[PDB]
């Protein structure tokens, strides 16, 4: 019938690995530092309670429900919940979003492997022996030469040969896990990766906590991040950033939680399991991810400079600043290795999660073998990634449409289909069925009224005071990426159409 997670621990760690990734260690620090630190945290915590938790339960429920009938992806699941052809089309986003995100996420993940390798072997810049630019410049040049940032006017990137080869290796590693399946692949790997990730992260926090310079200490960083600023609570931008981060960090709206949950046995609890996966992610994000790069940057440069660093380049903090700071300490190159190794495992456990939806669709709906499903998915991602590797800003365009606005739109869509169309009481029943614990009574009202209203308002503000600038103030090359990803949606819709026909073909054979 269908693969199933072998153990409860395996399920929890696989789901935790799905969630805990580059978003916790790279994205969170930038969003927080960029939005006033503590001022960002209030909306963040509220978004977690009003959006993160409820949507997590909903996605687990939708996945388990679909899995019981042999379906793990939204084109089919949405249809099961709402037998309307439009359900299948909306469901395509559950394949498109994770695919598009994988197309750039796996490449960023590959940079962490490449950096881990170079730092391990000591092929790193030799900063000069205390002028900040003289210290940071060598590391900025290191990153820029790796990914091939434009030195001229052309919006073209020229990745180093090493970077390209490392992306290939990274794709191979993802495949090596996925090709073994759910219990012998993803689950087995999670039991090894998560413990390693936790240990590495705790160690790094401890080392960072020992940092002190004439400019400050790690403590100043924590105070910056954990001191409330009730005067920003009225800024939509902060709310948009906070909600966006919650979706991204919890893997919500990517169809990934849903697919993983489709392997949970029909009787199995999802209330406690889902809540645990969610809380584990938040601890890894605010306690671990929040305690590494920000405190380190603030300790060495002070708050004002740390904040300016993050705003200047989203990848500055994790790929340039932290390694530069580490280089000023004994054994700093090895500490850099540990940081990038941590990022790699965090990324790896998440990228396999966003490639599994396409794999599940090809297996469940087009009946391909796991081997063929995994290889074709890898081929599509590998090929498509060339756009992200060679066209400047393609990555940002994909991250916006699929990884930012896309997931919020899809989150609202799945909630409406499950809690409104399918039926609020049928949905509530499905969520709580088999639960080790019941979902708190108040959450019924949050899921049915609060969450959808919250997201609806957010999306309207996004499309009215932000999306116009992205459509009018960007370089013309953004249309190359938009064109390509719209094509991917077209192709995936064609596959759903073919799945429909095979099912009809197959039914007229069941007759
Ligand atoms: C703004 N351009 C340069 C980066 C956008 C993508 N990006 C983002 C997005 C917002 C804030 C920070 C970061 C950096 C880390 C990260 C990690 C994984 C996937 C995407 C991201
Ligand atoms: C100690 N041994 C069992 C772990 C190393 C193997 N391991 C790993 C670990 C890191 C990178 C790649 C891979 C290969 C594929 C893979 C698949 C399932 C379980 C573990 C792994
Ligand atoms: C199958 C799809 C192929 C698309 C064309 C890919 C061309 C990649 O080309 C390779 O890029 C590397 C990184 O920039 C360079 O180091 C190599 O020398 C170059 O041959
Ligand atoms: C993980 C092992 C990766 C090995 C590939 C390293 C690519 C780094 O650099 C490349 O190495 C090639 C052969 O040494 C040279 O011919 C290229 O000119 C050089 O740029
Ligand atoms: C949209 C994605 C298009 C990918 C096409 C990539 C074509 C690669 O082009 C190659 O890149 C190498 C490294 O940058 C150069 O050294 C080669 O001279 C160049 O021909
Ligand atoms: C979005 C895709 C960006 C691809 C960047 C490709 C850079 C390739 O390199 C270019 O290839 C041309 C034709 O092969 C040559 O005529 C140019 O001299 C060469 O620089
Ligand atoms: C905005 C979302 C807030 C969620 C916090 C929920 C805290 C749980 O609250 C508890 O829920 C139980 C079950 O319904 C009740 O029996 C308890 O009386 C109630 O205090
Ligand atoms: C797209 C998701 C799998 C990303 C993951 N939740 C992270 O925080 O990195
Ligand atoms: Na996360
Ligand atoms: Na992960």
XYZ file of C-alpha atoms and ligand atoms in Angstrom:
664
model
C 0.000 0.000 0.000
C 2.167 2.824 1.286
C 5.467 3.253 3.127
C 5.087 4.330 6.743
C 7.440 5.861 9.288
C 8.902 2.980 11.296
C 9.098 4.668 14.701
C 7.637 7.630 16.578
C 11.127 8.980 17.252
C 12.011 8.591 13.593
C 8.867 10.457 12.562
C 9.521 13.283 15.008
C 13.165 13.714 14.027
C 12.364 13.532 10.291
C 9.674 16.197 10.728
C 12.027 18.228 12.926
C 14.678 17.982 10.209
C 12.117 19.019 7.604
C 11.586 22.201 9.646
C 15.020 22.910 11.159
C 17.252 24.151 8.359
C 18.853 27.192 6.759
C 15.817 29.201 7.840
C 16.750 28.849 11.512
C 20.423 29.701 11.221
C 20.586 32.063 8.250
C 17.133 33.531 7.577
C 15.918 34.152 11.144
C 18.953 36.204 12.252
C 18.702 38.479 9.206
C 14.943 39.022 9.576
C 15.286 39.736 13.296
C 18.305 42.051 12.978
C 16.693 43.755 9.995
C 13.479 44.428 11.925
C 14.742 45.785 15.246
C 15.575 42.541 17.022
C 13.248 42.493 20.016
C 10.692 44.511 18.046
C 10.485 41.622 15.570
C 10.040 38.996 18.282
C 6.601 40.054 19.533
C 4.904 39.741 16.122
C 6.983 36.583 15.565
C 5.678 34.909 18.728
C 2.107 35.983 17.952
C 2.405 34.660 14.395
C 3.660 31.345 15.805
C 0.584 31.034 18.048
C -2.022 32.289 15.573
C -0.563 30.895 12.351
C 2.312 28.460 12.844
C 0.766 26.053 15.332
C -2.722 25.862 13.765
C -1.454 25.436 10.194
C 1.012 22.761 11.331
C -1.842 20.667 12.734
C -3.923 21.281 9.617
C -1.145 20.152 7.281
C -0.423 17.032 9.346
C -4.134 16.224 9.287
C -4.456 16.784 5.546
C -1.435 14.597 4.898
C -2.487 11.710 7.121
C -5.996 11.884 5.616
C -4.653 11.738 2.078
C -2.122 9.048 2.901
C -4.898 6.745 4.097
C -6.236 6.770 0.538
C -2.833 6.455 -1.132
C -2.232 10.151 -1.835
C 0.509 12.356 -0.426
C 0.365 15.531 -2.523
C -2.146 18.386 -2.776
C -3.434 17.957 -6.332
C -5.125 14.754 -5.168
C -5.651 15.663 -1.508
C -7.353 18.986 -2.311
C -9.669 17.057 -4.633
C -10.466 14.497 -1.928
C -11.465 17.376 0.335
C -13.251 19.260 -2.428
C -14.288 17.246 -5.473
C -14.052 20.145 -7.904
C -11.643 20.313 -10.842
C -10.435 23.684 -9.553
C -9.191 21.860 -6.447
C -6.695 19.950 -8.585
C -5.381 23.140 -10.170
C -4.967 24.951 -6.844
C -3.323 21.762 -5.662
C -0.580 22.179 -8.263
C 0.959 24.841 -6.010
C 1.702 22.000 -3.588
C 4.131 20.640 -6.178
C 5.279 23.922 -7.718
C 6.221 25.743 -4.501
C 8.435 22.959 -3.114
C 10.021 22.360 -6.535
C 10.837 26.031 -7.114
C 12.181 26.404 -3.581
C 14.327 23.285 -3.994
C 15.765 24.796 -7.174
C 17.559 27.520 -5.187
C 17.583 26.038 -1.678
C 19.719 23.060 -2.729
C 22.225 25.438 -4.347
C 22.563 27.504 -1.158
C 22.926 24.220 0.739
C 25.740 23.282 -1.649
C 27.612 26.489 -0.745
C 27.661 25.336 2.887
C 29.189 21.999 1.865
C 31.761 23.749 -0.314
C 32.657 26.163 2.462
C 32.790 23.324 4.993
C 35.269 21.522 2.737
C 37.483 24.562 2.152
C 37.466 25.551 5.825
C 38.260 21.990 6.910
C 41.315 21.840 4.631
C 42.355 25.409 5.430
C 41.912 26.874 1.955
C 40.545 30.098 3.404
C 41.470 33.790 3.256
C 44.274 35.115 5.422
C 42.796 38.272 6.989
C 45.432 40.756 7.998
C 47.322 40.946 11.314
C 42.198 45.290 13.366
C 40.460 47.438 10.751
C 36.974 45.893 10.133
C 37.053 46.232 6.329
C 40.571 44.833 6.187
C 39.169 41.860 8.136
C 35.845 41.406 6.323
C 36.986 42.137 2.764
C 38.967 38.882 2.333
C 35.907 36.881 3.343
C 33.578 38.902 1.140
C 35.908 38.243 -1.804
C 35.921 34.555 -0.836
C 32.126 34.271 -1.088
C 31.955 36.439 -4.215
C 34.528 34.297 -6.039
C 32.725 31.111 -5.015
C 29.286 32.050 -6.358
C 30.686 34.380 -9.014
C 29.097 37.752 -8.225
C 29.039 40.203 -11.202
C 32.072 42.488 -11.374
C 30.754 44.312 -14.424
C 27.382 45.557 -15.654
C 25.980 42.271 -16.988
C 23.554 40.510 -14.573
C 25.552 37.312 -15.007
C 27.052 35.079 -12.323
C 30.151 32.954 -12.889
C 30.280 30.195 -10.216
C 33.721 28.733 -9.612
C 34.377 25.225 -10.920
C 34.602 24.011 -7.334
C 31.161 25.475 -6.540
C 29.630 23.772 -9.577
C 31.155 20.383 -8.722
C 30.035 20.726 -5.097
C 26.451 21.389 -6.259
C 26.622 18.113 -8.198
C 27.904 16.277 -5.122
C 25.162 17.888 -3.041
C 22.521 16.675 -5.510
C 24.052 13.204 -5.328
C 23.910 13.203 -1.525
C 20.233 14.268 -1.540
C 19.496 11.492 -4.034
C 21.374 8.885 -1.958
C 18.955 9.534 0.922
C 15.702 9.902 -1.054
C 16.331 6.822 -3.195
C 16.237 4.678 -0.047
C 12.729 5.900 0.729
C 10.934 6.976 3.888
C 11.918 4.534 6.645
C 15.291 3.401 5.296
C 16.193 6.787 3.861
C 14.732 9.973 5.325
C 13.910 8.526 8.741
C 17.210 6.656 9.087
C 19.142 9.776 8.121
C 17.192 12.010 10.516
C 18.167 9.811 13.458
C 21.816 10.513 12.624
C 21.599 14.118 11.440
C 19.421 15.737 14.104
C 21.559 14.648 17.074
C 24.677 15.826 15.228
C 22.988 19.131 14.373
C 21.919 19.762 17.977
C 25.382 19.004 19.382
C 27.171 21.166 16.810
C 24.728 24.037 17.397
C 25.017 23.939 21.194
C 28.811 23.870 20.938
C 28.826 26.897 18.626
C 26.546 28.863 20.941
C 28.912 28.147 23.844
C 31.950 29.283 21.842
C 30.132 32.429 20.681
C 29.130 33.181 24.284
C 32.842 33.438 25.122
C 33.363 36.260 22.625
C 34.284 39.649 24.034
C 35.929 42.625 22.376
C 36.290 46.339 23.124
C 33.018 46.758 21.206
C 30.900 44.415 23.299
C 30.037 40.884 24.382
C 27.664 38.178 23.169
C 25.318 39.288 25.957
C 24.764 42.613 24.186
C 23.530 40.578 21.234
C 21.006 38.640 23.297
C 19.717 41.864 24.864
C 19.271 43.336 21.391
C 17.250 40.311 20.277
C 15.221 39.813 23.451
C 14.320 43.366 24.491
C 10.716 44.323 23.549
C 9.978 47.447 21.491
C 6.199 47.904 21.693
C 6.520 50.838 19.291
C 7.009 48.791 16.131
C 4.012 46.539 16.795
C 2.121 48.960 14.550
C 4.320 48.418 11.475
C 2.892 46.109 8.758
C 6.369 45.464 7.384
C 7.465 43.807 10.620
C 4.298 41.706 10.666
C 4.839 40.686 7.054
C 8.429 39.712 7.860
C 7.388 37.823 10.997
C 4.593 35.834 9.341
C 6.780 35.119 6.342
C 9.531 33.763 8.593
C 7.070 31.587 10.528
C 5.846 29.967 7.290
C 9.358 29.474 5.969
C 10.843 28.128 9.187
C 8.037 25.678 9.904
C 7.932 24.468 6.283
C 4.285 25.553 6.078
C 2.668 26.166 2.701
C 5.352 24.145 0.876
C 3.320 20.941 0.695
C 6.239 19.278 2.493
C 4.655 18.794 5.912
C 1.611 17.375 4.142
C 3.640 14.853 2.154
C 5.664 13.694 5.176
C 2.431 13.298 7.148
C 0.973 11.129 4.376
C 3.297 8.366 5.597
C 1.907 8.493 9.134
C -0.403 5.517 9.804
C -4.128 6.407 9.783
C -4.510 5.665 13.503
C -1.365 7.536 14.570
C -1.484 10.739 16.609
C -0.609 13.988 14.838
C -1.628 16.449 17.559
C 1.275 15.837 19.935
C 3.656 14.875 17.124
C 2.945 18.029 15.154
C 3.199 20.267 18.203
C 6.517 18.649 19.177
C 8.021 19.088 15.703
C 6.917 22.718 15.805
C 8.306 23.413 19.283
C 11.599 21.689 18.464
C 11.951 23.977 15.444
C 11.232 27.096 17.468
C 13.792 26.169 20.105
C 16.390 25.546 17.396
C 15.478 28.887 15.816
C 15.215 31.345 18.698
C 17.590 29.655 21.154
C 20.199 28.193 18.804
C 19.954 30.182 15.575
C 19.291 33.376 17.481
C 22.265 32.882 19.798
C 24.987 32.363 17.189
C 25.365 34.972 14.441
C 23.695 38.011 16.044
C 25.556 37.803 19.385
C 28.831 37.184 17.538
C 28.341 40.138 15.179
C 27.213 42.472 17.952
C 30.098 41.446 20.214
C 32.684 42.296 17.559
C 31.041 45.294 15.849
C 28.326 46.583 18.161
C 24.583 46.626 17.488
C 24.409 49.480 14.960
C 27.111 47.957 12.757
C 25.736 44.431 13.119
C 22.328 45.644 11.950
C 23.844 47.517 9.000
C 25.701 44.342 7.997
C 22.495 42.302 7.807
C 20.603 44.950 5.825
C 23.438 45.287 3.282
C 23.365 41.664 2.194
C 21.189 38.800 3.380
C 24.083 36.345 3.073
C 26.645 38.613 4.761
C 26.043 37.468 8.319
C 26.390 33.734 7.814
C 28.866 33.462 4.930
C 31.116 36.461 5.487
C 30.788 38.010 8.926
C 30.727 34.942 11.173
C 33.704 33.247 9.494
C 35.617 36.557 9.592
C 34.948 36.907 13.317
C 35.915 33.275 13.946
C 39.186 33.831 12.069
C 40.231 36.247 14.824
C 40.268 33.436 17.386
C 42.446 30.370 17.963
C 41.073 27.392 16.062
C 38.754 29.783 14.256
C 39.084 28.080 10.883
C 37.909 24.801 12.406
C 35.070 26.668 14.138
C 34.185 27.944 10.665
C 34.204 24.351 9.453
C 31.794 23.320 12.237
C 29.460 26.215 11.406
C 29.260 25.304 7.713
C 28.983 21.599 8.534
C 26.064 22.499 10.821
C 24.458 24.514 8.016
C 24.942 21.657 5.568
C 23.164 19.065 7.738
C 20.437 21.600 8.560
C 20.005 22.255 4.862
C 20.208 18.597 3.795
C 17.468 17.431 6.172
C 15.241 20.186 4.748
C 16.006 19.863 1.034
C 15.090 16.164 0.993
C 11.766 17.324 2.476
C 11.000 19.685 -0.412
C 11.922 17.193 -3.107
C 9.779 14.418 -1.610
C 6.486 16.037 -2.726
C 7.374 15.734 -6.427
C 8.644 12.217 -5.744
C 5.403 11.247 -3.959
C 3.324 12.692 -6.782
C 5.215 10.728 -9.440
C 4.902 7.532 -7.375
C 1.316 7.974 -6.157
C -0.281 9.488 -9.257
C 1.862 8.492 -12.254
C 2.906 5.179 -10.730
C 6.644 5.546 -11.293
C 9.020 3.394 -9.253
C 10.747 5.212 -6.396
C 14.059 5.001 -8.266
C 12.642 6.673 -11.369
C 10.638 9.220 -9.377
C 13.713 10.273 -7.409
C 15.982 10.444 -10.459
C 13.562 12.499 -12.568
C 12.932 14.883 -9.682
C 16.693 15.288 -9.215
C 17.107 15.910 -12.958
C 14.447 18.631 -12.990
C 15.971 20.342 -9.955
C 19.561 20.021 -11.226
C 18.713 21.409 -14.662
C 16.507 24.227 -13.371
C 19.147 25.250 -10.826
C 21.348 26.477 -13.676
C 19.090 29.534 -13.827
C 19.827 30.300 -10.163
C 23.563 29.615 -10.592
C 24.071 31.862 -13.633
C 21.470 34.654 -13.572
C 21.968 37.321 -10.911
C 18.857 37.798 -8.727
C 17.066 34.731 -10.096
C 17.383 33.218 -6.612
C 15.667 36.256 -5.067
C 12.826 36.127 -7.600
C 12.172 32.440 -6.894
C 12.430 32.963 -3.140
C 9.827 35.720 -3.357
C 7.135 34.164 -5.557
C 7.358 30.635 -4.214
C 9.098 30.885 -0.853
C 7.490 34.071 0.416
C 4.191 35.203 -1.091
C 3.497 31.738 -2.501
C 3.551 29.901 0.828
C 1.344 32.485 2.548
C -1.201 32.278 -0.282
C -1.046 28.475 -0.218
C -1.402 28.387 3.558
C -4.619 30.404 3.322
C -5.772 28.223 0.433
C -5.298 24.930 2.276
C -7.036 26.283 5.382
C -10.071 27.447 3.377
C -10.324 24.131 1.535
C -9.922 22.044 4.702
C -11.697 24.118 7.356
C -14.312 25.908 5.247
C -15.124 23.838 2.163
C -14.412 20.342 3.513
C -16.092 21.341 6.762
C -14.855 22.914 9.991
C -16.336 20.140 12.131
C -15.149 17.359 9.814
C -11.703 18.989 9.821
C -11.620 19.402 13.608
C -12.616 15.749 13.969
C -9.942 14.577 11.520
C -7.231 16.568 13.318
C -8.075 15.207 16.777
C -8.670 11.595 15.721
C -6.112 9.331 17.397
C -4.464 12.217 19.203
C -2.444 11.480 22.331
C -3.748 14.894 23.366
C -6.599 16.976 22.028
C -6.132 20.324 20.335
C -7.004 23.169 22.748
C -10.722 24.138 22.421
C -9.969 27.789 21.590
C -7.969 26.757 18.507
C -11.152 25.720 16.702
C -12.171 29.378 16.577
C -8.639 30.448 15.692
C -8.459 28.060 12.730
C -11.927 28.875 11.417
C -11.932 32.666 11.865
C -8.704 34.228 13.178
C -6.024 32.558 11.052
C -7.760 33.042 7.677
C -8.665 36.647 8.532
C -5.094 37.294 9.677
C -3.591 35.936 6.455
C -6.206 37.567 4.223
C -5.383 41.007 5.611
C -1.649 40.327 5.328
C -1.892 39.297 1.670
C -3.943 42.387 0.794
C -1.372 44.709 2.361
C 1.396 42.819 0.572
C -0.180 43.124 -2.874
C -1.056 46.787 -2.374
C 1.990 48.419 -0.753
C 4.888 46.094 -1.716
C 4.257 43.862 -4.732
C 3.911 46.869 -7.054
C 7.500 47.960 -6.444
C 8.752 44.439 -7.208
C 6.783 44.532 -10.469
C 7.929 48.031 -11.459
C 11.376 48.585 -9.913
C 13.313 45.426 -10.848
C 15.850 44.765 -13.617
C 14.292 43.343 -16.799
C 16.010 39.982 -16.251
C 13.511 39.149 -13.495
C 11.156 38.240 -16.343
C 13.452 35.389 -17.377
C 12.910 33.738 -14.003
C 9.182 34.569 -13.910
C 8.783 33.100 -17.393
C 10.635 29.940 -16.459
C 8.772 29.262 -13.220
C 5.399 29.957 -14.834
C 6.471 27.327 -17.360
C 7.168 24.919 -14.512
C 3.617 25.490 -13.246
C 2.296 24.817 -16.754
C 4.279 21.560 -16.951
C 3.163 20.373 -13.532
C -0.457 21.116 -14.450
C 0.054 18.966 -17.546
C 1.304 16.121 -15.331
C -1.774 16.410 -13.103
C -3.881 16.253 -16.273
C -2.027 13.083 -17.307
C -2.549 11.607 -13.833
C -6.285 12.242 -14.320
C -6.294 10.393 -17.627
C -4.310 7.406 -16.321
C -6.820 7.145 -13.482
C -9.682 7.165 -15.984
C -7.708 4.729 -18.137
C -7.197 2.561 -15.069
C -10.838 2.826 -13.911
C -12.235 1.794 -17.292
C -10.024 -1.247 -16.616
C -11.389 -1.707 -13.159
C -14.664 -2.279 -14.991
C 18.155 38.692 -0.389
N 18.782 37.518 -1.074
C 20.212 37.789 -1.303
C 18.565 36.268 -0.269
C 17.146 35.750 -0.306
C 17.049 34.280 0.180
N 17.286 34.011 1.650
C 16.959 34.992 2.662
C 15.698 35.670 2.720
C 15.441 36.625 3.744
C 16.431 36.892 4.697
C 17.645 36.232 4.639
C 17.935 35.281 3.638
C 19.267 34.622 3.667
C 19.261 33.143 4.017
C 18.383 32.190 3.151
C 18.451 30.804 3.429
C 17.715 29.850 2.726
C 16.860 30.239 1.692
C 16.739 31.603 1.360
C 17.472 32.615 2.054
C 27.258 6.030 10.202
N 26.589 5.976 8.878
C 25.511 4.971 8.908
C 26.088 7.340 8.505
C 26.704 7.898 7.245
C 25.815 7.618 6.011
N 24.745 8.639 5.787
C 25.134 9.927 5.293
C 25.477 10.989 6.183
C 25.864 12.264 5.678
C 25.896 12.471 4.295
C 25.561 11.436 3.434
C 25.171 10.161 3.896
C 24.833 9.127 2.876
C 23.415 8.575 2.860
C 22.766 8.088 4.192
C 21.451 7.557 4.123
C 20.760 7.092 5.242
C 21.354 7.130 6.507
C 22.662 7.645 6.649
C 23.404 8.130 5.533
C 22.508 19.977 -18.750
C 22.357 21.481 -18.734
C 23.685 22.118 -19.014
C 23.620 23.642 -19.010
C 24.995 24.241 -19.297
C 25.918 24.103 -18.095
C 27.273 24.680 -18.360
C 28.146 24.519 -17.146
O 29.485 24.765 -17.560
C 30.460 24.683 -16.524
O 30.204 25.679 -15.444
C 31.188 25.643 -14.347
C 30.832 26.684 -13.270
O 30.617 27.986 -13.812
C 32.612 25.932 -14.940
O 33.593 25.896 -13.903
C 32.941 24.885 -16.029
O 34.227 25.136 -16.583
C 31.859 24.959 -17.140
O 32.120 24.007 -18.167
C 35.610 17.897 -3.452
C 36.756 17.851 -4.433
C 36.562 18.888 -5.501
C 37.697 18.882 -6.520
C 37.475 19.945 -7.582
C 38.206 21.209 -7.203
C 38.045 22.327 -8.192
C 38.839 23.500 -7.648
O 39.569 24.275 -8.641
C 39.793 23.721 -9.952
O 40.562 22.439 -9.904
C 40.816 21.835 -11.227
C 41.592 20.506 -11.083
O 42.342 20.431 -9.866
C 41.637 22.855 -12.090
O 41.899 22.309 -13.390
C 40.853 24.179 -12.211
O 41.590 25.112 -12.988
C 40.596 24.752 -10.791
O 39.873 25.985 -10.862
C 19.464 29.824 -17.332
C 20.663 28.975 -17.030
C 21.593 28.995 -18.197
C 22.819 28.154 -17.941
C 23.748 28.196 -19.134
C 25.175 28.176 -18.660
C 26.153 28.217 -19.792
C 27.526 28.186 -19.205
O 28.427 28.878 -20.056
C 29.790 28.634 -19.701
O 30.054 29.046 -18.297
C 31.433 28.823 -17.847
C 31.596 29.272 -16.385
O 30.777 30.401 -16.059
C 32.413 29.615 -18.778
O 33.766 29.399 -18.359
C 32.216 29.161 -20.246
O 33.099 29.876 -21.107
C 30.736 29.421 -20.656
O 30.499 29.019 -22.003
C 20.531 33.469 -17.382
C 21.599 32.704 -18.125
C 22.926 33.391 -17.993
C 23.998 32.622 -18.738
C 25.368 33.288 -18.639
C 26.229 32.726 -19.745
C 27.642 33.252 -19.839
C 28.229 32.510 -21.012
O 29.434 33.084 -21.533
C 29.247 33.722 -22.812
O 28.656 32.785 -23.808
C 28.425 33.376 -25.141
C 27.791 32.337 -26.092
O 28.127 30.988 -25.746
C 29.791 33.892 -25.717
O 29.593 34.475 -27.008
C 30.407 34.929 -24.740
O 31.649 35.411 -25.243
C 30.614 34.260 -23.347
O 31.180 35.174 -22.413
C -4.159 32.242 20.588
C -3.983 30.764 20.827
C -3.724 30.514 22.281
C -3.542 29.037 22.573
C -3.284 28.804 24.051
C -4.112 27.642 24.545
C -3.898 27.363 26.006
C -4.760 26.195 26.402
O -5.760 26.643 27.318
C -6.437 25.571 27.975
O -7.112 24.680 26.992
C -7.827 23.545 27.592
C -8.470 22.686 26.486
O -9.360 23.449 25.666
C -8.919 24.094 28.581
O -9.625 23.007 29.190
C -8.245 24.972 29.661
O -9.221 25.479 30.564
C -7.502 26.146 28.957
O -6.862 26.990 29.912
C 11.557 25.202 2.729
C 11.715 24.607 4.123
C 12.028 23.117 4.030
C 12.832 25.356 4.854
C 13.119 24.953 6.303
N 11.877 24.960 7.082
C 14.124 25.928 6.909
O 13.780 26.576 7.926
O 15.245 26.044 6.360
Na 12.989 26.013 10.306
Na 16.665 20.568 7.899
